[PDB]
Design a protein around this ligand. Structure first.
Ligand SMILES: [Mn+2]
Length: 664
RNA sequence: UUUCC
């Protein structure tokens, strides 16, 4: 196919993406930046003591607590699934270069042998039924906005007052914008209502990534992460190249004079996309009600809170298969965007709104700075959005899009390889809807719990069970992809939304339990993805508002991990060796300070009443709001806490907008 | 100095 058109920042098509204000102009030109993060107040991620501590702790834990994962990927025993070398990165210094995002993934899907559409009429009915059950009996709620998040293109505002106006104006003009777009007038819709333009592409750190220690050599080896250069991204991989980014941290020595201990590497960087907020608002105003619906009526499959919440569902199963999807977002199929839109139109959704939604999934991307001297290039033409990047992370319903794709993909897997007898129940729209409605409520012999690309597939006793074992066996074999839609395999060390499924000697769901992933405690405490941003006065606007609070929820979140005690002690000990102080005491102080600071933000918080009213979820979220993105939902957090992090647009304004969008 | 329960 066509190479995607590309425009340098100086071109008028890219200039038009940035308003005439300093923030926007700076965001367009920002060059590649790196530097140690402030892991905790006053402590840099590359401080020699800190790196010395990480070297001792990581070797020690790996030594004493080797992974306990069987050949079917189930974890048992110490609850450890891999070594602990993941903490060995110079946080804040990225691998170079980061990837150019692929402008079209059609070829990437075809070459991996994935389908370019529903392969059978049955699958077509199931994807559409997913749309009818998800988008149908919605209740308006206010549109909530994350504090301090940017409106990206074209204003790049972080001001709540300005964001609320942008959103309200957007709900008011979405209809006119959509209609413009239905007429092919995208430049007009963008110019008049800022609905269009591009996603603003930033690079985020995945702070821990695999590292192994080669026994032969005595040297550590970091996992290679492949990246696409510009030619490759704009040609969907037909030209250019895909190569291993460089994680070597040696350079930090001559560049910054930072001492780099042996076996420490640069961080894996991932692309992140900020959507043009005027376009996302009208999408988010539908998305939230959709979530409220599936997390209530289809709570069994989609609403996951605690380890025990998950556990209750899974222990009733006779077989539990922990799947893995490779690179979900970039393999996500545009044909599903078109199928969902087509079905929304059949259900009676406003065409103008469907068009806004369709366009949000075909938008050009403005690439910032993947490496020193590269970037500042707009991929795709905003005048006629036609990219196929897969799923953009900043689209307003990204989680729902991944969840609809995968939930149906895993059901198909179960039907295809284990439950042929259920096919006669899926004959037309009504029966598809009935069957999927029952399956999602956990009422069938095949079940699943999922969220985007994480899931656990279940079989109760019955006809499908024997097929379930053959599927599992097929996955263990790993030679044949069990799905025509995405690359599915089994998770090496089964886990679900952060909890590892700990199996005893019987290796059966009924006697298994969900424990916290101890390695994640270590990633969160010693390799955060951001520094403490102590320069940002308003903590509610920071990426890590109250880091100290996580100490208070630690026992609750990881206390069930078998080596919990051991890990806390190895930490205390290495921290002693490295810093001459008690880590525990260090965290109790951090805990007290943040606990006090938090009352400055909580109205109902007696200007010093404890943390008495806060749940463990509340605490993890206050220390790391990102978990509200990949793990929990607004509804899982105390309302007074929710207000610290979010602000809403009037219920009356969203209600009126939603009435003009929905069928009935 | 920049993203979506
Ligand atoms: Mn998993």
């Amino acid at each position: 196919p066509r190479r995607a058109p590309a425009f340098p920042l100086s071109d008028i098509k890219a200039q038009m993406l940035f308003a005439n204000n300093i923030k926007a102009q700076q965001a367009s030109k920002r060059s590649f930046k790196e530097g140690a993060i402030e892991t905790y107040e006053g402590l840099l991620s590359v401080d020699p003591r800190f790196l010395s501590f990480k070297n001792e702790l990581s070797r020690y834990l790996t030594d004493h607590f080797p992974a306990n994962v069987d050949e079917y990927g189930r974890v048992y025993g110490n609850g450890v699934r891999t070594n602990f070398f993941g903490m060995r990165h110079m946080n804040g210094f990225p691998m170079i270069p980061a990837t150019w995002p692929l402008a079209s993934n059609l070829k990437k899907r075809a070459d991996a042998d994935l389908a370019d559409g529903p392969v059978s009429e049955r699958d077509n009915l199931l994807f559409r039924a997913a749309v009818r059950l998800m988008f149908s009996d919605l209740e308006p709620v206010p549109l909530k906005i994350r504090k301090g998040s940017s409106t990206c293109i074209p204003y790049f505002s972080n001001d709540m007052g300005t964001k609320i106006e942008i959103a309200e104006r957007a709900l008011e003009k979405a209809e006119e914008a959509g209609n413009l777009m239905l007429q092919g007038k995208f430049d007009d819709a963008y110019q008049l209502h800022q609905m269009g333009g591009a996603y603003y592409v930033v690079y985020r750190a995945q702070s821990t990534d695999a590292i192994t220690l080669d026994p032969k050599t005595g040297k550590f080896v970091s996992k290679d992460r492949m990246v696409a250069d510009f030619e490759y991204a704009v040609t969907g991989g037909e030209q250019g190249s895909l190569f291993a980014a460089s994680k070597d941290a040696s350079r930090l020595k001559e560049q910054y004079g930072i001492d780099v201990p042996d076996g420490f590497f640069c961080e894996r960087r991932r692309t992140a996309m900020g959507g043009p907020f005027a376009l996302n608002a009208p999408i988010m105003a539908v998305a939230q009600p959709v979530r409220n619906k599936i997390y209530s009526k289809y709570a069994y499959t989609f609403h996951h809170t605690t380890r025990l919440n998950k556990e209750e569902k899974v222990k009733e199963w006779s077989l539990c298969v922990a799947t893995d999807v490779s690179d979900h977002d970039t393999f996500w199929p545009g044909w599903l965007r078109d199928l969902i839109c087509d079905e929304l139109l059949n259900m009676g959704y406003a065409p103008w709104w469907v068009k806004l939604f369709e366009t949000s999934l075909k938008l050009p991307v403005y690439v910032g700075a993947p490496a020193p001297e590269q970037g500042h290039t707009l991929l795709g033409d905003p005048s006629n959005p036609d990219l196929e990047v897969g799923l953009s992370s900043g689209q307003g319903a990204t989680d729902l899009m991944g969840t609809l794709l995968m939930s149906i993909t895993y059901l198909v897997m179960q039907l295809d390889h284990t439950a042929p007898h259920l096919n006669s129940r899926i004959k037309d729209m009504p029966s598809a809807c009935r069957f999927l409605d029952s399956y999602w409520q956990g009422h069938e012999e095949i079940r699943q719990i999922s969220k985007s690309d994480d899931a656990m597939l279940g079989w109760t006793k019955g006809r499908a069970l024997v097929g379930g074992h053959r599927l599992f066996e097929m996955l263990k074999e790993g030679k044949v992809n069990p799905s025509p839609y995405m690359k599915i395999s089994y998770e090496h060390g089964g886990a679900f939304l952060g909890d590892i499924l700990l199996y005893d000697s019987r290796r059966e769901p009924g006697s298994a339990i969900f424990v916290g992933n101890i390695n994640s405690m270590l990633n969160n405490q010693f390799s955060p993805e951001y520094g403490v941003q102590s320069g940002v006065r308003d903590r509610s606007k920071r990426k890590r508002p109250f880091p100290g609070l996580a100490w208070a929820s630690m026992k609750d979140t990881y206390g069930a991990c078998p080596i919990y005690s051991d890990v806390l002690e190895a930490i205390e000990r290495c921290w002693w060796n490295a810093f001459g102080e008690s880590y525990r005491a260090y965290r109790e102080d951090m805990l007290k300070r943040d606990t006090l600071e938090l009352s400055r933000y909580v109205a109902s918080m007696a200007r010093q009443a404890g943390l008495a009213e806060l749940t463990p979820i509340d605490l993890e979220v206050l220390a790391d709001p990102n978990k509200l993105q990949y793990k929990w939902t607004e509804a899982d957090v105390s309302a007074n806490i929710h207000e610290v992090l979010m602000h809403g647009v009037s219920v009356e304004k969203t209600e009126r907008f939603l009435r003009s969008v929905m069928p009935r």
